[PDB]
Scaffold this motif. Structure first.
Motif, PDB file in Angstrom:
ATOM      1  N   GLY A   1      37.536  17.773  14.330  1.00 40.70           N
ATOM      2  CA  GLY A   1      38.921  17.350  14.367  1.00 40.70           C
ATOM      3  C   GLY A   1      39.223  16.341  13.276  1.00 40.70           C
ATOM      4  O   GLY A   1      38.409  16.078  12.385  1.00 40.70           O
ATOM      5  N   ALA A   2      40.413  15.757  13.366  1.00 37.14           N
ATOM      6  CA  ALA A   2      40.947  14.887  12.332  1.00 37.14           C
ATOM      7  C   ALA A   2      40.691  13.415  12.650  1.00 37.14           C
ATOM      8  O   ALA A   2      40.710  12.992  13.810  1.00 37.14           O
ATOM      9  CB  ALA A   2      42.448  15.123  12.157  1.00 37.14           C
ATOM     10  N   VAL A   3      40.451  12.637  11.600  1.00 36.17           N
ATOM     11  CA  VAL A   3      40.308  11.189  11.693  1.00 36.17           C
ATOM     12  C   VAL A   3      41.511  10.531  11.036  1.00 36.17           C
ATOM     13  O   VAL A   3      41.885  10.890   9.911  1.00 36.17           O
ATOM     14  CB  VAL A   3      39.023  10.698  11.018  1.00 36.17           C
ATOM     15  CG1 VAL A   3      38.913   9.182  11.199  1.00 36.17           C
ATOM     16  CG2 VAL A   3      37.804  11.427  11.588  1.00 36.17           C
ATOM     17  N   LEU A   4      42.095   9.549  11.722  1.00 36.62           N
ATOM     18  CA  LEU A   4      43.156   8.704  11.184  1.00 36.62           C
ATOM     19  C   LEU A   4      42.586   7.316  10.915  1.00 36.62           C
ATOM     20  O   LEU A   4      41.965   6.716  11.801  1.00 36.62           O
ATOM     21  CB  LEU A   4      44.338   8.612  12.155  1.00 36.62           C
ATOM     22  CG  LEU A   4      45.460   7.680  11.682  1.00 36.62           C
ATOM     23  CD1 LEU A   4      46.244   8.327  10.531  1.00 36.62           C
ATOM     24  CD2 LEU A   4      46.392   7.300  12.804  1.00 36.62           C
ATOM     25  N   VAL A   5      42.785   6.823   9.693  1.00 36.64           N
ATOM     26  CA  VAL A   5      42.288   5.525   9.254  1.00 36.64           C
ATOM     27  C   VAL A   5      43.462   4.586   9.025  1.00 36.64           C
ATOM     28  O   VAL A   5      44.511   4.986   8.500  1.00 36.64           O
ATOM     29  CB  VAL A   5      41.447   5.635   7.969  1.00 36.64           C
ATOM     30  CG1 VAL A   5      40.655   4.340   7.716  1.00 36.64           C
ATOM     31  CG2 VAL A   5      40.526   6.803   8.070  1.00 36.64           C
ATOM     32  N   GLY A   6      43.265   3.324   9.411  1.00 32.71           N
ATOM     33  CA  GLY A   6      44.187   2.260   9.067  1.00 32.71           C
ATOM     34  C   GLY A   6      43.403   1.014   8.710  1.00 32.71           C
ATOM     35  O   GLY A   6      42.193   0.944   8.932  1.00 32.71           O
ATOM     36  N   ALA A   7      44.112   0.024   8.162  1.00 32.39           N
ATOM     37  CA  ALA A   7      43.486  -1.235   7.782  1.00 32.39           C
ATOM     38  C   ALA A   7      44.535  -2.343   7.717  1.00 32.39           C
ATOM     39  O   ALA A   7      45.692  -2.111   7.355  1.00 32.39           O
ATOM     40  CB  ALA A   7      42.756  -1.106   6.438  1.00 32.39           C
ATOM     41  N   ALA A   8      44.109  -3.553   8.061  1.00 31.85           N
ATOM     42  CA  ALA A   8      44.965  -4.725   7.922  1.00 31.85           C
ATOM     43  C   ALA A   8      45.068  -5.146   6.445  1.00 31.85           C
ATOM     44  O   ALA A   8      44.177  -4.850   5.642  1.00 31.85           O
ATOM     45  CB  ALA A   8      44.417  -5.879   8.766  1.00 31.85           C
ATOM     46  N   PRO A   9      46.167  -5.799   6.054  1.00 29.18           N
ATOM     47  CA  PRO A   9      46.272  -6.317   4.685  1.00 29.18           C
ATOM     48  C   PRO A   9      45.078  -7.193   4.343  1.00 29.18           C
ATOM     49  O   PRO A   9      44.615  -7.986   5.164  1.00 29.18           O
ATOM     50  CB  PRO A   9      47.576  -7.125   4.711  1.00 29.18           C
ATOM     51  CG  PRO A   9      48.390  -6.482   5.800  1.00 29.18           C
ATOM     52  CD  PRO A   9      47.384  -6.063   6.842  1.00 29.18           C
ATOM     53  N   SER A  10      44.552  -7.003   3.125  1.00 31.14           N
ATOM     54  CA  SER A  10      43.451  -7.790   2.571  1.00 31.14           C
ATOM     55  C   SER A  10      42.122  -7.520   3.272  1.00 31.14           C
ATOM     56  O   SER A  10      41.283  -8.408   3.359  1.00 31.14           O
ATOM     57  CB  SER A  10      43.759  -9.291   2.599  1.00 31.14           C
ATOM     58  OG  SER A  10      43.591  -9.817   3.910  1.00 31.14           O
ATOM     59  N   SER A  11      41.922  -6.301   3.770  1.00 30.14           N
ATOM     60  CA  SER A  11      40.659  -5.919   4.393  1.00 30.14           C
ATOM     61  C   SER A  11      39.604  -5.609   3.330  1.00 30.14           C
ATOM     62  O   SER A  11      39.923  -5.329   2.172  1.00 30.14           O
ATOM     63  CB  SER A  11      40.858  -4.705   5.298  1.00 30.14           C
ATOM     64  OG  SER A  11      41.653  -5.033   6.423  1.00 30.14           O
ATOM     65  N   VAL A  12      38.331  -5.654   3.739  1.00 25.98           N
ATOM     66  CA  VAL A  12      37.213  -5.544   2.808  1.00 25.98           C
ATOM     67  C   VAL A  12      36.207  -4.462   3.179  1.00 25.98           C
ATOM     68  O   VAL A  12      35.215  -4.288   2.465  1.00 25.98           O
ATOM     69  CB  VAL A  12      36.487  -6.897   2.644  1.00 25.98           C
ATOM     70  CG1 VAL A  12      37.446  -7.942   2.120  1.00 25.98           C
ATOM     71  CG2 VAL A  12      35.842  -7.345   3.967  1.00 25.98           C
ATOM     72  N   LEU A  13      36.415  -3.719   4.265  1.00 24.26           N
ATOM     73  CA  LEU A  13      35.445  -2.716   4.679  1.00 24.26           C
ATOM     74  C   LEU A  13      35.954  -1.295   4.486  1.00 24.26           C
ATOM     75  O   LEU A  13      35.260  -0.343   4.859  1.00 24.26           O
ATOM     76  CB  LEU A  13      35.049  -2.937   6.141  1.00 24.26           C
ATOM     77  CG  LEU A  13      34.576  -4.351   6.437  1.00 24.26           C
ATOM     78  CD1 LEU A  13      34.411  -4.532   7.959  1.00 24.26           C
ATOM     79  CD2 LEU A  13      33.281  -4.688   5.706  1.00 24.26           C
ATOM     80  N   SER A  14      37.125  -1.131   3.874  1.00 22.27           N
ATOM     81  CA  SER A  14      37.766   0.178   3.815  1.00 22.27           C
ATOM     82  C   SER A  14      37.084   1.098   2.814  1.00 22.27           C
ATOM     83  O   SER A  14      37.052   2.313   3.023  1.00 22.27           O
ATOM     84  CB  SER A  14      39.250   0.020   3.475  1.00 22.27           C
ATOM     85  OG  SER A  14      39.938  -0.688   4.510  1.00 22.27           O
ATOM     86  N   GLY A  15      36.544   0.549   1.726  1.00 21.69           N
ATOM     87  CA  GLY A  15      35.760   1.372   0.819  1.00 21.69           C
ATOM     88  C   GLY A  15      34.526   1.947   1.487  1.00 21.69           C
ATOM     89  O   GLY A  15      34.187   3.119   1.288  1.00 21.69           O
TER      90      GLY A  15
END
Lengths: 432, 460
Positions: free
Chosen positions: A19-33
């Motif tokens: 199935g599908a994954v939805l990603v989000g992140a808070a402003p100025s996050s550092v683990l998204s890469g």
């Protein structure tokens, strides 16, 4: 009352996420890469809202992040993953609301809610430490509220340890973690090591105590499924069942009493021909339930000995006498009773709280990339009406659920998973 | 409805873990003396290091104290002036209001049987509303890994005793940092006393700090305290106990509650401050309100709200308001007081978390986040405090209030039943625990989060 939802469990190495994954992140996050790289590695359809910075992180690693129309209330996501590392203070906790409220009905059955933050003790400011601590209250409430067999977890990544998150994110995204919910996992800095993700124990030799039956047998099957040669250990009285289990997994047997003074010596000698021992799972354990007032002295002593002292002696021998290979693994088995206590279990709960201390105070002194962790199983199918339904899954777990979590700890790739006690309880109501 | 709950899986879950309902009327505080009504049995593992400090407390409170055949313990107690009467090990009849065990001498897991040796012979001789108190060495401060492990195991033991002994008996482990034995007294008194009636199954950490003089009968004498949310409910009960212990209490609540604030302050000889704690200037006004009384010594952050809703149905402002009142407003006030000379030396910040902040709860993604944040506020402020100031929190479980009748039946019934006391707590139980943190003597109690829950089954 409804009957429980049937949980999705491991079927094949691929896909990691169906199935599908939805990603989000808070402003100025550092683990998204680091998150985006795992999603690219596992080749899942990945989606993102109107977050340009996060879109740029996926571009940097070649992840085609399909934009998710915020007006879409109908699409379903098997997992929703949120980088909370950018939340710097309590007012920014509404970043959790902004991401999760719009999709709170769109997580699929047997789905995954995963919040990835910064370990509060490693946060550079007190305000961020407070906010990151708050994430646990949020995820535990999500775990109780979303239903449908969905699990909810917070993964804390020590400041600077983004490169060490992959095996944990993979486990949580996958059906292997079907009965792990409401839990806090800490990822720390360590060397990254090459692995075959389809066979993450390939080439390794594992030893499982109490292997002739029950959860120990299930552990042995999953370790062999991941590519390990499994030495199945139990008392010589269980030789026939040991032989049966070993024959089912291409493993070997070692029929000794784990409490004997020479157990560590014999374990090391047994693994020498395979090139040394990589993984030891201390699954051997007993209950001798009795109120303290009625309990005989030897039934206190026996439970402490088999459940705690015996693993201590073996660990001491192996760690002091080159008995575990580099990047080796020690996995212990605690219990919800060790965390929460239980009537009639003053001996057992003491022993299993001891096991938590064994993990917590051995972890800092390990060298050579060896890690130590424990599972704490809740109600697993083998007070029974009590346990079964009193969790967010509304059902008892299976032996394979405990084995999968042990196998994630043991993975060659889990170099940065150390000192963790992770309950396998479907988010049981009980706790400390 | 009640019989249906019992027959349901959650009702069977309760009965399998705690037995059928046999709650006790719990003893609570009546007067400063005696601290403990009844006899105390003391024990210690070989090579223990906390028994002189324990004995000094038992001597200070003048309780009838007993001991088995432990010569080293008898000699150490006599040295510091405590008469320990021998307790004949063949006596299955005598009752003890408290049993106190020094476990610091347990050096490894094989020595955990010292717990069995002391507690199994007297497991049916603890009085109703009695106390099981195990005192050990904080595992993080133990000199060897083997002892750290054994001291960590004490919590599993006491949590099981707390569920097993029944009769309104509470069970605690007190961890004393290596070298911090002189800082134990206010905690041991609190646990020995009926003040701690609804605290059970918990872990308390005592750390090294100055030992300050105190009047134990009025442990807040001379001090000025501020209680938020003071106009009713648990905040009103907190204000009563702080005044009982000698403090001048400034009662804070919103201007809409001015009538009740006036009523509470007149009941305790205190004063009022009618403001919204979330206002940007709340910290300034708090400092000003205490200025003419020698400054502020104690602040209790009791103001708190719920806005229960599933996350899917929750409006943005109902998320924001809960985080603000329950967490961000206390951060602002603490930041202001700690940076602008707003708390006196040896001052006290006491916060209020909740079991839901620890365990989570359906419909409380906002509230549980805010109350988990409060735990972080305690844990990460404590190391940076100076001047003898401490910060701690209570985390209440199910407490009987005037708001309890608004709780739906099934949530309220589980609240009452799912704990070792087999009953809901009272506001005074929360207030007493807050008051113990606030004690002028509680200098080495810092960074603790202590549940006031009667050992609720819920947790992390």
């Amino acid at each position: 009352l409804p009957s429980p939802v049937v949980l999705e469990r491991f079927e094949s190495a691929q896909p990691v996420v169906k199935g599908a994954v939805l990603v989000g992140a808070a402003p100025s996050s550092v683990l998204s890469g680091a998150i985006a790289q795992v999603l690219s590695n596992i080749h899942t359809d990945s989606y993102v809202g109107n977050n340009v910075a996060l879109q740029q992180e996926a571009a940097k690693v070649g992840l085609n992040l399909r934009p998710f129309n915020a007006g879409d209330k109908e699409s379903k996501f098997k997992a929703v993953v949120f980088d909370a590392s950018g939340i710097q203070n309590s007012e920014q906790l509404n970043e959790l609301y902004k991401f999760f409220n719009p999709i709170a009905r769109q997580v699929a059955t047997s789905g995954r809610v995963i919040v990835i933050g910064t370990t509060p003790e490693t946060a550079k400011t007190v305000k961020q430490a407070i906010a990151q601590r708050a994430l646990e209250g949020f995820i535990k409430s999500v775990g109780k509220e979303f239903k449908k067999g969905i699990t909810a977890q917070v993964v804390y990544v020590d400041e600077g340890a983004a490169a060490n998150l992959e095996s944990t994110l993979r486990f949580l995204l996958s059906p292997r973690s079907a009965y792990v919910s409401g839990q806090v996992i800490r990822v720390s800095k360590a060397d990254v090591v090459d692995v075959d993700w389809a066979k993450p124990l390939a080439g390794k030799t594992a030893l499982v105590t109490g292997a002739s039956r029950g959860i120990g047998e299930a552990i042995a099957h999953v370790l062999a499924r991941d590519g390990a040669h499994v030495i199945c250990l139990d008392v010589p009285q269980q030789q026939a069942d040991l032989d049966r289990v070993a024959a089912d997994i291409g493993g070997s047997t070692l029929a000794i009493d784990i409490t004997a003074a020479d157990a560590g010596e014999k374990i090391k000698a047994a693994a020498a021909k395979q090139g040394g021992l990589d993984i030891i799972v201390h699954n051997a354990g007993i209950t001798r339930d009795k109120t303290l007032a009625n309990m005989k002295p030897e039934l206190w002593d026996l439970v402490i000995n088999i459940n705690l002292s015996a693993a201590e002696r073996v660990n001491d021998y192996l760690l002091e006498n080159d008995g575990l290979n580099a990047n080796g693994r020690i996995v212990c088995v605690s219990s919800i009773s060790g965390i929460a206590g239980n009537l009639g279990q003053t001996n057992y709960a003491a022993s299993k709280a001891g096991v938590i201390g064994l993990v917590k105070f051995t972890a800092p002194i390990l060298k050579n990339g060896i890690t130590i962790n424990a599972v704490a199983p809740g109600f697993i199918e083998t007070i029974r009406e009590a346990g079964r339904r009193m969790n967010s899954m509304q059902q008892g777990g299976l032996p394979v659920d405990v084995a999968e979590t042990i196998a994630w700890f043991a993975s060659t790739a889990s170099t940065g998973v150390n000192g963790n006690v992770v309950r396998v309880c479907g988010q049981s109501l009980l706790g400390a």
